Design a protein around this ligand. Structure first.
Ligand code: D4Q
Length: 269
């Protein structure tokens, strides 16, 4: 990227994954900032096909609560993806450990998260890695869904398909990924949104994983909401969490019903 780096200063690393890093690029003349995701395709034999899929998915996106994708180019074995710079950073860094954030803030971010997820689901895309590290903020603190490296199509025109890949970040993963051979895509993203809401409200993830061998998950199935993180959560958002974090995905609340929830619609301070 020799001509590009002559005109653009790769000022600093914004973040990192396993595939590579995200850099802040600032044009020396215009001072325009863009984020550059740099991926070494030699990290895995299937990395060229996976990055092709991420770019393909990125090209389909156009929504106020999704990070804008500008383009990409390959230079040898390195892939460069150019994205809208989200100067508010990760939602993760608005979460005070063991505290969370004010309830009106968490509600506003949750509404924006639902708008982004409704959009993705409406075009038949599932994110599969919703977590505060993958939710960015722009200069006005509007939430933007980011990192589509695990995203896939679950509906072709008006025909759904089930998914079977165990992927995502384990404390955010729905229990059906650990119990069913195949499962519907939408309830999985609904579940991870519920874990994000829990983290925003109490600054703590509730369990290592929603599995049989996890005591913290058994505690939640047993309605022990007098234990952390639940005891830090007001009854109104907790009632919504009781509908989202439902073990059976067919009984789990859908996004149209989340939009009808009392706390979701609650006028806060
Ligand atoms: N498109 C982007 O702008 C972008 C993309 N990826 C990022 N990081 C990854 C790391 C792995 C997990 N997913 C997010 C970040 C971090 C950013 C940031 C951080 C601190 C302050 C600040 F103002 C901005 S911006 C940005």
């Amino acid at each position: 990227a020799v001509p590009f780096v002559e005109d653009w200063d790769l000022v600093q690393t914004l973040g990192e994954g396993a595939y590579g890093e995200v850099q802040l690029a600032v044009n020396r003349v215009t001072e325009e900032a863009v984020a550059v995701k740099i991926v070494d395709m030699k990290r895995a034999v299937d990395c060229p096909e996976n990055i092709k899929k991420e770019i393909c998915i990125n090209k389909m996106l156009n929504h106020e609560n999704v990070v804008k994708f500008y383009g990409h180019r390959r230079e040898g074995n390195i892939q460069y993806l150019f994205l809208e710079y989200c100067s508010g950073g990760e939602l993760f860094d608005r979460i005070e450990p063991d505290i969370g954030m004010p309830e009106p803030d968490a509600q506003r971010f949750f509404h924006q998260l639902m708008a982004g997820v409704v959009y993705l689901h409406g075009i038949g895309i599932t994110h599969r890695d919703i977590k505060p590290e993958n939710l960015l903020l722009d200069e006005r603190d509007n939430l933007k869904i980011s990192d589509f490296g695990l995203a896939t199509v679950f509906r072709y025109n008006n025909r759904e398909r089930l998914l079977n890949k165990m992927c995502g970040t384990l404390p955010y993963v729905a229990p059906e990924l650990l119990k069913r051979r195949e499962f519907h895509a939408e309830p999985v993203d609904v579940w991870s949104c519920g874990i994000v809401l829990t983290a925003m409200l109490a600054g703590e993830l509730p369990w290592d994983q929603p599995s049989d061998s996890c005591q913290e998950y058994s505690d939640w199935k047993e309605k022990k909401t007098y234990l952390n993180p639940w005891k830090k959560i007001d009854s109104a958002p907790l009632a919504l969490l009781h509908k989202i974090l439902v073990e059976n995905p067919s009984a789990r609340i859908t996004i149209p019903d989340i939009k009808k929830d009392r706390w979701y619609n609650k006028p806060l301070k």
